[PDB]
Swiss-Prot record, chain A:
Post-translational modification note: Phosphorylated on serine residues in response to UV irradiation.
Function: Required for assembly and stability of the aminoacyl-tRNA synthase complex. Mediates ubiquitination and degradation of FUBP1, a transcriptional activator of MYC, leading to MYC down-regulation which is required for aveolar type II cell differentiation. Blocks MDM2-mediated ubiquitination and degradation of p53/TP53. Functions as a proapoptotic factor.
Other known facts: Accumulates in brains affected by autosomal-recessive juvenile parkinsonism, idiopathic Parkinson disease and diffuse Lewy body disease.
Residue numbers of the full-length protein present here: 51 to 82 of 320
Gene: AIMP2
Record's subcellular location: Cytoplasm, Cytosol; Nucleus
Record's disease association: Leukodystrophy, hypomyelinating, 17: An autosomal recessive neurodevelopmental disorder characterized by atrophy of cerebral cortex, spinal cord and cerebellum, thin corpus callosum, abnormal signals in the basal ganglia, and features suggesting hypo- or demyelination observed on brain imaging. Clinical manifestations include lack of development, absent speech, microcephaly, spasticity, seizures, and contractures.
Protein name, entry field: Aminoacyl tRNA synthase complex-interacting multifunctional protein 2
Subunit composition and interactions: Part of the multisynthetase complex (MSC), a multisubunit complex that groups tRNA ligases for Arg (RARS1), Asp (DARS1), Gln (QARS1), Ile (IARS1), Leu (LARS1), Lys (KARS1), Met (MARS1) the bifunctional ligase for Glu and Pro (EPRS1) and the auxiliary subunits AIMP1/p43, AIMP2/p38 and EEF1E1/p18. Interacts (via N-terminus) with KARS1. Interacts with EPRS1. Forms a linear complex that contains MARS1, EEF1E1, EPRS1 and AIMP2 that is at the core of the multisubunit complex. Binds FUBP1 (via C-terminus).
From Swiss-Prot, chain B:
Part of the full-length chain shown: 4 to 74 of 312
Residues that span the membrane, as ranges: none
Protein name per Swiss-Prot or TrEMBL: Aminoacyl tRNA synthase complex-interacting multifunctional protein 1
Primary role: Non-catalytic component of the multisynthase complex. Stimulates the catalytic activity of cytoplasmic arginyl-tRNA synthase. Binds tRNA. Possesses inflammatory cytokine activity. Negatively regulates TGF-beta signaling through stabilization of SMURF2 by binding to SMURF2 and inhibiting its SMAD7-mediated degradation. Involved in glucose homeostasis through induction of glucagon secretion at low glucose levels. Promotes dermal fibroblast proliferation and wound repair. Regulates KDELR1-mediated retention of HSP90B1/gp96 in the endoplasmic reticulum.
Domain of life, source organism: Eukaryota
Organism this protein belongs to: Homo sapiens
Post-translational modification: Cleaved by caspase-7 in response to apoptosis to produce EMAP-II.
Illness association: Leukodystrophy, hypomyelinating, 3: A severe autosomal recessive hypomyelinating leukodystrophy characterized by early infantile onset of global developmental delay, lack of development, lack of speech acquisition, and peripheral spasticity associated with decreased myelination in the central nervous system.
Region (Required for fibroblast proliferation): 3-43
Quaternary structure note: Homodimer. Part of the multisynthetase complex (MSC), a multisubunit complex that groups tRNA ligases for Arg (RARS1), Asp (DARS1), Gln (QARS1), Ile (IARS1), Leu (LARS1), Lys (KARS1), Met (MARS1) the bifunctional ligase for Glu and Pro (EPRS1) and the auxiliary subunits AIMP1/p43, AIMP2/p38 and EEF1E1/p18. Interacts (via N-terminus) with RARS1 (via N-terminus). Part of a complex composed of RARS1, QARS1 and AIMP1. Interacts (via C-terminus) with SMURF2. Interacts (via N-terminus) with HSP90B1/gp96 (via C-terminus). Interacts with PSMA7. Interacts with TARS3.
Localization per record: Nucleus; Cytoplasm, Cytosol; Secreted; Endoplasmic reticulum
Amino acid sequence: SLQALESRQDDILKRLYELKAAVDGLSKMIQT
Amino acid sequence: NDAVLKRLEQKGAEADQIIEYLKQQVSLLKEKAILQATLREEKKLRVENAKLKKEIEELKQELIQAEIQNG
Amino acid sequence: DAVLKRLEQKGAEADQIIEYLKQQVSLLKEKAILQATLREEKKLRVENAKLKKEIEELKQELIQAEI
């Protein structure tokens, strides 16, 4: 339960940083 | 409670930051796409309206010729 | 109890937000590709024109050597 919440939140964070990598990658290659 | 509840806030708050950051970056990228679209929608309207005007003058110019020859 | 019940409620809708935001980025990325692929096809069509033009120019230039 509490052992499963932190693993869940760990995934959310891992997925949130993957989104950021993609979003930031886009912001670079379409500029000016 | 425990110090685990501590860093379950440090992780739940860290996610709230990235969500905010991501909404702001996707909204900017949406505006780029809206800008690029509206800019293209200008030139099509500029070009088309120039053709419509060129035909109005040529319709007007022959409305004078038809008025003279019939008068 | 009151903390972990909400700590899992937001962590459940956050999976929906990640899926929502991932949709938008997919949508935006494809638009970026479409914009890129179109101008690349245009250049490749211009290049393809110059290449066939230059192929035939070299063909006639080969006949002066035959003289």
